[PDB]
Design a protein around this ligand. Structure first.
Ligand SMILES: [Mg+2]
Ligand SMILES: [Mg+2]
Ligand SMILES: [Mg+2]
Ligand SMILES: [Mg+2]
Ligand SMILES: [Mg+2]
Ligand SMILES: [Mg+2]
Ligand SMILES: [Mg+2]
Ligand SMILES: [Mg+2]
Ligand SMILES: [Mg+2]
Ligand SMILES: [Mg+2]
Ligand SMILES: [Mg+2]
Ligand SMILES: [Mg+2]
Ligand SMILES: [Mg+2]
Ligand SMILES: [Mg+2]
Ligand SMILES: [Mg+2]
Ligand SMILES: [Mg+2]
Ligand SMILES: [Mg+2]
Ligand SMILES: [Mg+2]
Ligand SMILES: [Mg+2]
Ligand SMILES: [Mg+2]
Ligand SMILES: [Mg+2]
Ligand SMILES: [Mg+2]
Ligand SMILES: [Mg+2]
Ligand SMILES: [Mg+2]
Ligand SMILES: [Mg+2]
Ligand SMILES: [Mg+2]
Ligand SMILES: [Mg+2]
Ligand SMILES: [Mg+2]
Ligand SMILES: [Mg+2]
Ligand SMILES: [Mg+2]
Ligand SMILES: [Mg+2]
Ligand SMILES: [Mg+2]
Ligand SMILES: [Mg+2]
Ligand SMILES: [Mg+2]
Ligand SMILES: [Mg+2]
Ligand SMILES: [Mg+2]
Ligand SMILES: [Mg+2]
Ligand SMILES: [Mg+2]
Ligand SMILES: [Mg+2]
Ligand SMILES: [Mg+2]
Ligand SMILES: [Mg+2]
Ligand SMILES: [Mg+2]
Ligand SMILES: [Mg+2]
Ligand SMILES: [Mg+2]
Ligand SMILES: [Mg+2]
Ligand SMILES: [Mg+2]
Ligand SMILES: [Mg+2]
Ligand SMILES: [Mg+2]
Ligand SMILES: [Mg+2]
Ligand SMILES: [Mg+2]
Ligand SMILES: [Mg+2]
Ligand SMILES: [Mg+2]
Ligand SMILES: [Mg+2]
Ligand SMILES: [Mg+2]
Ligand SMILES: [Mg+2]
Ligand SMILES: [Mg+2]
Ligand SMILES: [Mg+2]
Ligand SMILES: [Mg+2]
Ligand SMILES: [Mg+2]
Ligand SMILES: [Mg+2]
Ligand SMILES: [Mg+2]
Ligand SMILES: [Mg+2]
Ligand SMILES: [Mg+2]
Ligand SMILES: [Mg+2]
Ligand SMILES: [Mg+2]
Ligand SMILES: [Mg+2]
Ligand SMILES: [Mg+2]
Ligand SMILES: [Mg+2]
Ligand SMILES: [Mg+2]
Ligand SMILES: [Mg+2]
Ligand SMILES: [Mg+2]
Ligand SMILES: [Mg+2]
Ligand SMILES: [Mg+2]
Ligand SMILES: [Mg+2]
Ligand SMILES: [Mg+2]
Ligand SMILES: [Mg+2]
Ligand SMILES: [Mg+2]
Ligand SMILES: [Mg+2]
Ligand SMILES: [Mg+2]
Ligand SMILES: [Mg+2]
Ligand SMILES: [Mg+2]
Length: 232
RNA sequence: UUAUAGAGAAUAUAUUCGUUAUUAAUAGAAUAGAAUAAUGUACUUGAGUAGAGCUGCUUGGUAGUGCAGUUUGAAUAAAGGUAGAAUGAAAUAUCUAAGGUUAAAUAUAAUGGUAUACCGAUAGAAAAUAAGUACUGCGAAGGAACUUGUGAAAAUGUGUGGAGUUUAGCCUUAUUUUUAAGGACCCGUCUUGAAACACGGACCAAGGAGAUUAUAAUUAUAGCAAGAUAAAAAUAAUCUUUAUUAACUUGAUUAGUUAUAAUUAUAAGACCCGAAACACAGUGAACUAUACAUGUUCUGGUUGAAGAUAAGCAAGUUUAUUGGAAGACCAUAAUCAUUCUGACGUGCAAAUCGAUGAUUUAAGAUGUGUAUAGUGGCGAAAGACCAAUCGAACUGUGUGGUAGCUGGUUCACAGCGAAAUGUCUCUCAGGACAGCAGUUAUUAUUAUAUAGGACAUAGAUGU
RNA sequence: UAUUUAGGUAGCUGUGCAAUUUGUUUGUAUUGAAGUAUAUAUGUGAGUAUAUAUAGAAGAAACAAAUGAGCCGAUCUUGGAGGCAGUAACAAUAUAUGUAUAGAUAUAGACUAGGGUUUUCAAUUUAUUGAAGUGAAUCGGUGUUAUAUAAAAACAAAAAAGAUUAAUAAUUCUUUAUUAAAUUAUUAUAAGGUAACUUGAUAAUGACAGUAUAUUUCAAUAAAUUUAAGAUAAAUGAAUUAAAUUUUUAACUAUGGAUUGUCAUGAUAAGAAAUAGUUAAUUAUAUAUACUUGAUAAAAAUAAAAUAAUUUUAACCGUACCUAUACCGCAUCAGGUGUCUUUGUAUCAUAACAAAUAUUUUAAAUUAAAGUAAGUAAGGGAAUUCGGCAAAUUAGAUCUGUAACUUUGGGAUAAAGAUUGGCUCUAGCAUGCUAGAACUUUUACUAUGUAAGGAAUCUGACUGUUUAUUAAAAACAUAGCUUUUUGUAUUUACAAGAAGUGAAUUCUGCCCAGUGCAUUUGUUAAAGUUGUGUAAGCGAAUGUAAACGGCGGGAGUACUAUGACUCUCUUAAGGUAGCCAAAUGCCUCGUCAUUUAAUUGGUGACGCGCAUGAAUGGAGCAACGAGAUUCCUACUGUCCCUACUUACAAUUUUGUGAAACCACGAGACAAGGGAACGGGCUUGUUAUUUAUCAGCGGGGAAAGAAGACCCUGUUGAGCUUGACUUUAGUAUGUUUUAAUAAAUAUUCGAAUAUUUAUUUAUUAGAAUAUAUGGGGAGUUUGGCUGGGGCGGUACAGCUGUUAAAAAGUAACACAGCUGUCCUAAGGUAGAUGAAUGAUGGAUGGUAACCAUCAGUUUAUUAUAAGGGAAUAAAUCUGCUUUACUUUAUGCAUAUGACUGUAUUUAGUAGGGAAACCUUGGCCUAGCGAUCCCAAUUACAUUCAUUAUGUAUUGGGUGAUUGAAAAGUUACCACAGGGAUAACUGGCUUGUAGCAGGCAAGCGAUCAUAGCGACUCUGCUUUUUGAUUCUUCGAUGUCGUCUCUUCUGAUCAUCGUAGUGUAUAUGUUACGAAGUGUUGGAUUGUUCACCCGGUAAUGAGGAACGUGAGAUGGGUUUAGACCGUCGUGAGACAGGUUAGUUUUACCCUACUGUAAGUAUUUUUGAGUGAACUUUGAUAGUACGAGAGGAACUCUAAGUGAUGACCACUGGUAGUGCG
């Protein structure tokens, strides 16, 4: 046969990988004050970024919900908690919304980068100095304290309301996000290109649930499912 | 010009260069003599080695013959290694590993010489050289013709002579030979069977296919013979005859050996020409496909969503304007290819021409630059496209790849003359053994003998 | 001394001729060698010798030697030259005197890619030779970069006119300018305005989407004026052409205190209008606003300034010419190729015409046929056809008017009507647009351009894309819906990877037994330790079907009929909601209705559905479609049935001048035999213009291509998988791993294991074992066979028949059997009337047991069949293990293994008194090599244990004298085969068709007017079979259209004869092939069945007549859909839709044309009696009545055929409007 589509797409990512910003905030020993300068828009991502200014140095950050040009925010380990400020994790009471959490201390940020997605805090445990967070995916993860984070819900709202009612709307989405579009179903192909292909009618003939035990080039279909079907 | 010179060239129908035989100059090498320089003390022995366990390659080496990866890793001459089945033990022989140098006898191109039972311009190298040239391919690469005198055949022109219009050419017999009577389908080839409506062949010249080598055997000839011989080299072995047997136990005997020639068998490109394929090493995105950067992309009409203004009727609701949204509607230039199954169909053209059709601000069209290569790329998916080639591109090598299968195989006369049947076979388009044939040889009561016969006698059988 | 022998394919042996070179001997030649061409002699023949002509330098013979040693063929290799043939195919403007007067076709001009002297001139005839020609501080390159080699179109210091040369000119020359660098002369270091700001007085940027509307800057039109030009027989308030001169707004500041603008949306207490003022007005590629987006629209090098002057200061490379007859397609090729500019009329444009500019020289003609284009048609209007394929009708603009349905947006420009010129005026205001009125005519968008309409069904939601060169679609994509993996992402869950269905509306039923997937607690390798112990995986349990998939059958029960209800086999569950003879139903052209004169078609209903059915999605149509199918209206040469005109090729002339093909073709036919369809062979019948010209497609099984279909080959390739053998990747053990201290557990002070802490290590790996592993890699996938496949094994053994009186012998011929059974069913000694029948005997019967008599093989002998045995080879009783060990040989049987079975020398045993018998079954069947493994007996080496050898058995190949092995190809390839199928032909006639002989009976009695049972004998090649003789280096399949000819087994028409013939109307038989046999609906049809009509719609042949005559509907390559089968690639004589039809110019045949005049005769060939009907005969003959003819005589008509233009109709580059 020939090399299929999945392996040929990953080696096309090594010839020209996709490029993004990775915005991080600095670290400062005591509480300082900074000003918001302007709001911009990037090519790949939907959430707008913000340029703040600490000690006559301009950095880049993800914009929170209510933010206007010229406003003042504070950064430090013991800043007061309000909209757009960045404090330590232990100060916030249970029930609020944070949107950039570093895994360890003195890191930029790891969790909650996209627009419209936020996390919640559920508790504090004074023994061993740990707090449990509620991830946007729905899983409870235990975080160590003394990491610092930003208070508020991120901007850009709910983008998934109105559909791509035309085909032309989805053309410019996948082109900016560097994905392959359109896609051909694997049953329509000839049996050289794909395992499911060929035949006299369009059907599969093999079970579509494939274990994870098998090697890398044999993985296709619903890989390693614990369940299949509508629940009710 | 007799000759230490009769090797060979050149001129014309008796002369020269040389051969033969002698010297000189320069460079290099070796041997010997004479002279100049020079001579003290020296007790070293080879470690992450040799060897074991697991694992892979190599050799004739069989249970390592040799080498390497990983783990482990000794003794120092009162010591260590080896001795053609395995391990353990013992005697007798014989050697001392893990550091270094080394002439001669030996193998073969570019470059220059000397010879020959080799070829003589379709031969000999691709090239008697303005030849690795003219010319072709995007590229790796491919690659010819032509000497000087004589003037054959195929195919034509002019002149003279002759027949008839109902019959090409050939054989026999005839002085009615440019006619008469008899005979006579076109050759080669597979085939039970060919003039066949079975295949190859329009015509002339030149070229063109069982030769060479190794190992065996039979026949003819030559030298010596209980022995036979040009092995390498310089001025021994082998065969008669390994005497049998697995071995022990045992054992005389078919004139040979060396060469020359013809035939047969096996292996070498192997009588000549012919596949679809496989591996090694390299070249292409100028056509066409996709992504990224930078530029360019003619003109006229149709319809009427949000938003806004007024005038009526009385929380609102009818009428008239303004406005110009949409993968909305229609045409020219540009683009594509539904139908006539129109034209053409040794074409204008290795895909064109005419009428009729479809198409319009976009998921469009197009120039240039960078990225993607053949068990690989690109793909709104037809196995489509990747330089007129794609269900695995193109160029060179292994390569004169293998063929139980089609085709061809070159002079005369004389003697002799077949099979299409039995058995075994992954055997049925093929092989081997038996049968039928040919050639040569020795010998006579195996004529006191034989017979695809008859007669006399003794019998077998179940149509 | 052949009085005896002599043919011969495949094949074997002997004697001889030809060519090139080598050693020795003998000889020739310039008064002429070798070669070549004609004769003569000689040899049975391969060949040799001589003579004459030509030419000019070396060659011959004998005895021996070495081979690249003798051509008709190979679709053989290279060169030269024929026929067809001067044939096909192409090129062909006018002038009596000209560097001109006319005609004709074509839009034209600049930068780049490519070309490289083609440029210009001279001389000689799109050629040859020779000279000359390209001038740069400001026109390109050289510079910067596109997130470790990138731009002649992105960014960047600066110029224009006017003339010169045979050819260069933003480059030479004249005139007026600009930039940068080096040297000179001179100098402000700040003023002014309340403010916005003005003047020598620095630190700025390169730099960035698309669409719509409003400005009318320039420019261009239009007008006026001034100089000039060209024409008219005439006439014209003065025409036509050329050159120039002219035709307030936006920000900001100061007062002010509440209104005000645009074509549209508005602006203002974060200060409107109105005043006073300061900056600018970006030149159409501009300015200001508005609108669309999960798209927000590149990088880097790069900066200073006042006034005047100077310069042998500004380097290197290219600057000719062509834009298609100077590029690429082998070419002076109807193809292809980036950007820009271009005048006049043109009331939306388009189309068309004219300017401008560039090219160009001489055959004939009122006449062929058949072609390629363009026109017109009386009457009928789809009757032609698979199908309205091709053509025709409609169309612009203004005014009325507009339905069912609906996803409320659409449908809609629906459909259906009416109007349109020219000239003279009137009326509006926005001043070039729109309404109305009068007059007039061979009536008005129509030169060019410009929608036929309506009603239904199947399928796809829509815009979009695709097999460059036979398929544009119902295929692909798409939004929408759903499932799944990942919290250690250069990117961070509204994100990033993997799959299925296919807009909206309404729904998405049951099953976890099978195969997969996930989660969790019996079997299983190596390495290490004195020894021992510990892996994943497989197996088991629980979930999961918008995962692969699946979703039965039989019996009774309420006048007939049916079964709400009941009983019953099993299973994982037994197709629910829906839908249908549908693109899915074989029987099948299902049943009913409707559409038509007539329907296998279309639409609506019915359902025990061969084989429908729910995201492998079911149901459904509003909008959209060069998709597939049926019916109405209009329209027409598609047809009845064809006719006329023009142009270009063709026919006639000159010039340039080919190809396919060719065994021999010298005239053609009927029958015969033959390799079963002859141009040539055998018997018959026949042509001929002085050697032609133009047509045509019957034949040469015509030409192209070593058949793609089918079969064979111990020949291949693409693809799939539960085929055989393995491997990359990955999971899990063991051993290697920095030191230290401590804790805990397991084994016996010690050995193991687990876990924590510190820093003194921390490049991050290495060596082995087990499992998973079509993601990959090699290779295989028997034979026989009345073609192959499916079925059987006729592939190993045994018996009887075929089988023909010695031995031997075939068929997918006949009837059968075999891979077993037995410690006794083996060995031996002895005794013995078996099976059955008759007559009797308490319970006792057809049949229980006991006696008597008879009893030739009927009984038994393990088994298939055949053979053998009656003091028995059978049944009983006793005793035993010959179901042995060693030397030699034979028979099936052979040229030959393995096997079965008879016989021998010498031992050791059993039965018997002894003679004797015994090496498994009474005889003919139950039969297996080389290599390797296991066992038994002997011995062999310095020593123990082991290994290796000789001998005998067992383990086994059933394809049985013996490889280790699954499929598919419609994407396919190679070598071959008429040794072998699909089509024609040939022998045969079971089947098909057409007739005969005899006479039981029917017919009111009567066999034969007319029929005829049970049986029997034939012909024809017209159905379908059976066989495989000719063709696989090719003979073009079914049906239809057009056209000719032939047969009798006669449908009418003609002549006779029977009758169960009164007339009329029938029916049967004999002679007879002259002439007729005609129109439509449905289906690809042949066949079939209806409507209508007539004198009568007869049966058939000619390669199942006829494709270089046509068409292409089905069948039959590559796209695609449904149903059934297969895990899968795939398959279906089950159903659909779209799919390139080549070549005549040879020979022969056929139609015409081609022999000095003028009058005729004879012979030969063709052709030579079509059919219906009115009136009279006549209401007559004949008949109870009803009814109801004929001979003959007049009047017409249809079908065919030969001519003609007085009348009518069609046509018309002849003629007029
Ligand atoms: Mg496909
Ligand atoms: Mg595959
Ligand atoms: Mg489907
Ligand atoms: Mg040593
Ligand atoms: Mg020669
Ligand atoms: Mg040569
Ligand atoms: Mg004859
Ligand atoms: Mg034959
Ligand atoms: Mg024949
Ligand atoms: Mg043939
Ligand atoms: Mg030929
Ligand atoms: Mg020759
Ligand atoms: Mg070859
Ligand atoms: Mg390679
Ligand atoms: Mg549109
Ligand atoms: Mg055509
Ligand atoms: Mg390369
Ligand atoms: Mg396909
Ligand atoms: Mg190609
Ligand atoms: Mg003979
Ligand atoms: Mg053969
Ligand atoms: Mg033989
Ligand atoms: Mg007798
Ligand atoms: Mg003879
Ligand atoms: Mg030869
Ligand atoms: Mg020849
Ligand atoms: Mg020959
Ligand atoms: Mg030739
Ligand atoms: Mg012409
Ligand atoms: Mg020139
Ligand atoms: Mg010029
Ligand atoms: Mg100039
Ligand atoms: Mg120039
Ligand atoms: Mg120029
Ligand atoms: Mg061009
Ligand atoms: Mg051209
Ligand atoms: Mg004419
Ligand atoms: Mg008409
Ligand atoms: Mg008419
Ligand atoms: Mg019809
Ligand atoms: Mg008809
Ligand atoms: Mg049409
Ligand atoms: Mg009027
Ligand atoms: Mg569509
Ligand atoms: Mg095509
Ligand atoms: Mg289309
Ligand atoms: Mg097409
Ligand atoms: Mg689809
Ligand atoms: Mg749906
Ligand atoms: Mg299950
Ligand atoms: Mg369930
Ligand atoms: Mg049902
Ligand atoms: Mg339906
Ligand atoms: Mg009907
Ligand atoms: Mg003409
Ligand atoms: Mg004949
Ligand atoms: Mg015959
Ligand atoms: Mg002719
Ligand atoms: Mg062939
Ligand atoms: Mg074979
Ligand atoms: Mg293969
Ligand atoms: Mg494979
Ligand atoms: Mg076979
Ligand atoms: Mg017995
Ligand atoms: Mg055999
Ligand atoms: Mg197919
Ligand atoms: Mg072939
Ligand atoms: Mg045959
Ligand atoms: Mg035929
Ligand atoms: Mg019959
Ligand atoms: Mg033919
Ligand atoms: Mg042919
Ligand atoms: Mg008759
Ligand atoms: Mg027939
Ligand atoms: Mg026919
Ligand atoms: Mg044809
Ligand atoms: Mg024909
Ligand atoms: Mg067709
Ligand atoms: Mg299935
Ligand atoms: Mg089918
Ligand atoms: Mg007559």
């Amino acid at each position: 046969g020939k090399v299929t589509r999945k392996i040929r797409e990953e080696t096309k990512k090594l010839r020209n990988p996709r490029k993004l910003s990775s915005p991080k905030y600095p670290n400062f020993p005591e509480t300082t004050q900074g000003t918001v300068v302007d709001l911009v828009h990037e090519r790949g991502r939907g959430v707008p970024l913000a340029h703040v200014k600490f000690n006559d140095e301009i950095y880049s950050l993800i914009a929170t919900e209510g933010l206007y040009t010229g406003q003042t925010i504070f950064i430090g380990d013991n800043a007061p908690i309000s909209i757009g400020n960045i404090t330590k994790l232990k100060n916030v009471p249970g029930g609020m919304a944070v949107h950039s959490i570093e895994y360890d201390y003195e890191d930029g940020g790891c969790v909650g980068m996209t627009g419209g997605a936020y996390s919640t805090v559920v508790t504090h445990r004074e023994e061993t100095n740990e707090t449990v967070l509620g991830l946007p995916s729905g899983q409870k993860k235990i975080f160590s304290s003394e990491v610092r984070c930003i208070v508020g819900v991120p901007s850009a709202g709910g983008i998934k309301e109105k559909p791509f009612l035309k085909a032309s709307v989805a053309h410019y989405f996948n082109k900016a996000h560097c994905k392959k579009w359109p896609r051909v179903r694997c049953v329509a192909m000839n049996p050289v290109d794909h395992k499911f292909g060929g035949g006299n009618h369009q059907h599969v003939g093999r079970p579509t649930t494939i274990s994870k035990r098998r090697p890398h080039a044999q993985l296709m279909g619903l890989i390693g499912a614990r369940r299949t079907g509508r629940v009710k």
